[PDB]
């Protein structure tokens, strides 16, 4: 079976007993045992959950691991996978990787004898020197955010395995749909399921999976022992969620690049960042490791003191601070994480144009 | 408001739009903003999660109240407070998980341990160390419910450098608020009484101090182990009947530690209304009630697997604090006094005299 | 919404309840609670001081803002954050009270200062000590309007583990905003240019950072040199009209400059505006306009005096930023000669002021 | 109207008084007036409407005040350097085509100009070159034979900073892909004879201007040297230039299958084509283009396999022109320039295994197989 098929099929998509096309929601706490040391399969919906369970195999599938996890947000799961190490341990960052990953190491990790060392990841040489004797991981993330900064997987994997290193990627803004960093010598991926997954701007959600068996032995202790869980609920809404994937990544694609083409050919914008641009750097590296670009995009404009004027005077974009929603919404990196990042969404293409016209006509 | 009142009316109740007697639930990632410069992401605050979040802190008497994906989301983030090289004083029967979250996940992230009997106040004093920065209490304890004094404690804490912390969990807020008696933080497992229905897993913790209010904040958003609208909704609703549901759980549970203290095949039982109890007086001082919580030990050991498997209306299982009465061998589940023996009863709220027959009955078959 | 919108209907600039387009005035020491457990005490929260708050963060791109008794009081609170010990950088020029708040002040409680010139950059590198925590910036600057570029300082200051501390009451929210240039705290006189209409002493403090706006809030609560009801709102009334003051003195303080400057008997002019000036390039960059703040010496430097009393229109007070014209001898009330007159240009007619002038110069050698 | 509909409408593109859909042809040399001092043609060196119609296509195009068309490529580009007193200096691009570079030498140098040979895409270079007499700047980009790109805006801000007029020369790139004009250059240049015409069956030269007193300069002289464009070829020029969008489409598309083919090659080097993310300037390329054209060129690794190469080449046809229909192949080295000394043809980056190739609107497989066939034999 296809990606768009098993985007419906994959994982658990059935209730096995009942035959239900979709996953019962499981709201419970616990659960009753036959014997002692004899489960049904399920003892605490904090170890495991069969609405959690049925979403975690899911992604599993869809990215190619053995498992999966799903956490109560991203970031918790990025927590829950740095939680693997020791402290006196070190993890290479891009320079340009999203902000409460920053923060995380920054504020949270750093300060429990976890170092890290910023460097431009798309510099494969940046990588090499800044290894110490104790680097542990390198945590990737491409495209990255904003700027959509494309990182050579299968290279830094390569370079990173004759070390004794882990490769950590964060697919959240190229979905399992466009990108599989497993299948380029990734050893564990990590999504915002808050974002494209779920693609209705209504969960916020955290996946991760692995393609190693000790990983996951790993990776499931500190679920069970931190207990960032993803709630049942929010579960099968990210799974439904998920079912659309396919169709809302490619209208993501579809209108934003007509967005990034008709930015490209504007009198007040100057540069533009987009992957599907055959003039964006590395663009031959992307078509190379994607099957296709999301709707995320960057972009600056000839006069940088408007940028907060053209935003607020768009009425089809929502200004917020999120993205990856079938809603298009619009921020500034500046004072939320004059260059303004847009999240095109699926409405029809022709309203997202005349709606960044009229904005442009007001500056 | 008294505190039944409250449990009903208390922090945001209701929906102030519309009048809806219940909070809307937000199943929602991001808000539209008006700005750029109320509510802005789903995980750094959501109105389904912070009227929950204002009523636990309404409830202990807290200047904010925060909510987690579980009991241990909670602790976890409470001790996030803290730099490597700092201690952290422990009682030796603290909850199973907490225990393992020092030894497998905090210990190697750089934080130092040492187990006291928190019943002992001067073996407290003794094991202070110049980087104890916190002592950890939980009272009743679990499984043993052994007794705590939370004013002499959080005293010695106060007058040293000391952080005084407690697992209200057993108690609720129902019958204990440890805030009002000297502690700083306060954290609840949101999974037990508070949703009282078995069917939520959730973590609440509030303090006293604005400035640890703002740690804990911004440890909750920046690890990201928060409570869903959905569970904060559904923990809301269970709370409204948590004052009604530990009466019931307490009339239940006294009347079977009086049944098990007064059986043939029973040694001991451990629970905290029963006069014959260490600290009995102790816990009328600092408790408004006893919970539904009681353990016993049978005279003969080797029959305690055969008794919990014969159990009729006791659910054989992992939790407890629900409407459905749970059992469990500690020694084989969750898990100094803890004999392969002892059993565990959850008294939930049914019949008095269906519970007493189901105990009868489990006796007859050993 | 646009500056020129944002000052009248801004932070809070409406009663929520009542529906009034006025911000009540909370004439109240205390509230009734349904405690234990929104306002406490006015000294921690006034519904009336809040809105003119809320205005101000919202006028300099702040997240919270802070309304003293004077400007000083707020410049106080602001260096309150800071231990003994602990060392900062001020400009060669700051405020004349800003200088005897450091030298009387905050230095016997421990605190140290380096007298600077912050035009020169390269001087404030050589300046840093082990122990120093901020750099405190003035520009324009009182009352020669030096100035200083706000987004090198700020970057300087901020590879450094330093503050950045801006004393924006010359150039105000309305042409300059140094918290987007980089800038951590911004000071106000409200009693200036944000009051406009000379009847009011105030100071607001603004900040960029949560933990920063935590301690500026701890502080002023603390030492409670905060400003009363009645003040705040006539504070946010007064700021109502900014924009269409500081259009006005701009347009009166360049017409002085040009006539000041072609004029015989005048000798130099300090104005940001003048192409001729230090850094104008520098001044059109990081500010939107000019104030009405000039000063000038004339060749004649014992006859400053006589001009300065013979002034009919402007009038021979201490302060600036009102809507009646000013005048001072900044040395009566490192540049300042003692023959420097200080012109704090209004919002009355061009011709009457440039008229008040000719006359004056005629009547001096 | 936008520009795929300005090659049909733009100018005069209708006899208003016929109603044809084609303007007229008109093979006259002079017109009946109706009183002496009362004309609005006289006489067809001056005006024929036959070429005005295709002088105003050519301005409405590139967005000019006025159009010129002239015999050839040189003529117009002699008639704009006929502005230009005795004494005059101007800085003229280093990889400029023969004829210019010609033009300057053996014609203009001898009648009191003279020049200064710059990079371009150097911008430095032009402000370090710039004489008090100096009075125009002289650009072509993409160029000939390497493709180089060149910062109109900048380079036409820095000459209007001075005291400078700025003359592009838009052949390569039409004014379907570049407009100079709309980037600050006083004066645009075009060779019809090119992409303009499309079907290598004219020769022409087109001028236009965004400047009135240039416009009424470039007329005096236009008229006063008398090398006008006839009306024959005026026609034909405006005929090939209402497919000039759909051509350049073709030439793009194919000239980017083959430099995407020809760089994957294992007996290739260098490919120069401005359409390739890994060519010079790229960035700049993009932002001023809207489009890059059929030019491109290469240099095989055994610079002597060159000229086996060409030989067996078989549907790209072997000649001196470029921009038609029909694909076309030369050696710089030998076509064009083996009259400069192999080792200054070397410097300037002109190898003995440079090729060059104008490539055409045929089947894009075809001209693959063409290709892949010549390699063969090598
Ligand atoms: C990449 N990784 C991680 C995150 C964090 O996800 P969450 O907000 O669900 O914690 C984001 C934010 O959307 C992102 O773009
Ligand atoms: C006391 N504290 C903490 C916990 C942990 O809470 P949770 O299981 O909801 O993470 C439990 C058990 O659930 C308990 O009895
Ligand atoms: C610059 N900063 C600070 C101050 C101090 O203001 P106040 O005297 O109102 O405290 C003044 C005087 O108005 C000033 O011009």
């Known amino acids: 079976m296809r990606m768009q098929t098993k985007l419906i099929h994959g994982g658990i998509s059935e209730d096995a007993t009942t035959g239900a096309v979709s996953v019962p929601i499981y709201q419970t706490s616990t659960y009753?045992?036959?014997a002692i040391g004899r489960h049904?399969?399920?003892e605490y919906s904090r170890s495991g959950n069969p609405t959690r369970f049925?979403?975690?195999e899911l992604i599993?599938?869809?990215e190619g691991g053995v498992k999966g996890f799903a956490f109560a947000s991203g970031l918790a799961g990025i927590h829950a996978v740095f939680s693997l190490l020791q402290s006196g341990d070190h993890v290479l960052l891009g320079d340009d990787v999203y902000g409460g990953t920053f923060r995380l190491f920054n504020q949270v990790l750093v300060k429990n004898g976890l170092s890290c060392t910023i460097i431009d990841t798309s510099d494969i040489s940046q990588i090499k020197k800044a290894i110490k004797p104790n680097t542990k991981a390198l945590y990737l993330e491409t495209p990255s955010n904003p700027l959509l900064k494309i990182t050579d997987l299968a290279q830094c994997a390569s370079v990173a395995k004759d070390h004794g290193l882990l490769t950590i990627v964060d697919n959240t803004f190229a979905t399992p749909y466009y990108q599989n960093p497993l299948l380029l010598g990734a050893d564990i991926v990590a999504h915002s399921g808050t974002k494209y997954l779920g693609g209705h701007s209504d969960v916020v959600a955290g996946l991760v999976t692995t393609n190693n068996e000790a990983l996951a032995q790993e990776i499931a202790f500190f679920q069970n022992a931190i207990g960032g869980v993803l709630g049942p609920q929010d579960s099968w809404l990210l799974q439904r969620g998920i079912k659309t994937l396919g169709l809302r990544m490619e209208a993501?694609?579809?209108?934003?690049?007509?967005?990034?083409?008709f930015l490209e050919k504007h009198p007040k914008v100057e540069r533009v960042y987009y992957p599907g641009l055959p003039t964006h750097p590395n663009y031959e590296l992307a078509k190379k490791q994607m099957r296709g670009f999301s709707g995320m995009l960057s972009f600056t404009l000839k006069n940088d003191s408007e940028a907060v004027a053209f935003v607020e005077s768009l009425k089809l974009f929502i200004l917020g601070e999120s993205l990856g929603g079938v809603e298009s919404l619009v921020g500034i990196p500046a004072?939320?994480?004059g260059l303004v990042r847009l999240s095109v969404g699926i409405e029809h293409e022709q309203d997202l144009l005349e709606d960044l016209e009229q904005a442009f006509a007001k500056i």
Not at 252 to 261: D, R, S
């Open 54 to 56: 049925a979403l975690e």
């Open 32 to 34: 009753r045992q036959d």
């Open 335 to 337: 004072f939320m994480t």
């Open 60 to 62: 599993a599938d869809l």
């Open 252 to 261: 993501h694609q579809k209108n934003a690049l007509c967005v990034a083409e």
């Open 40 to 42: 049904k399969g399920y």
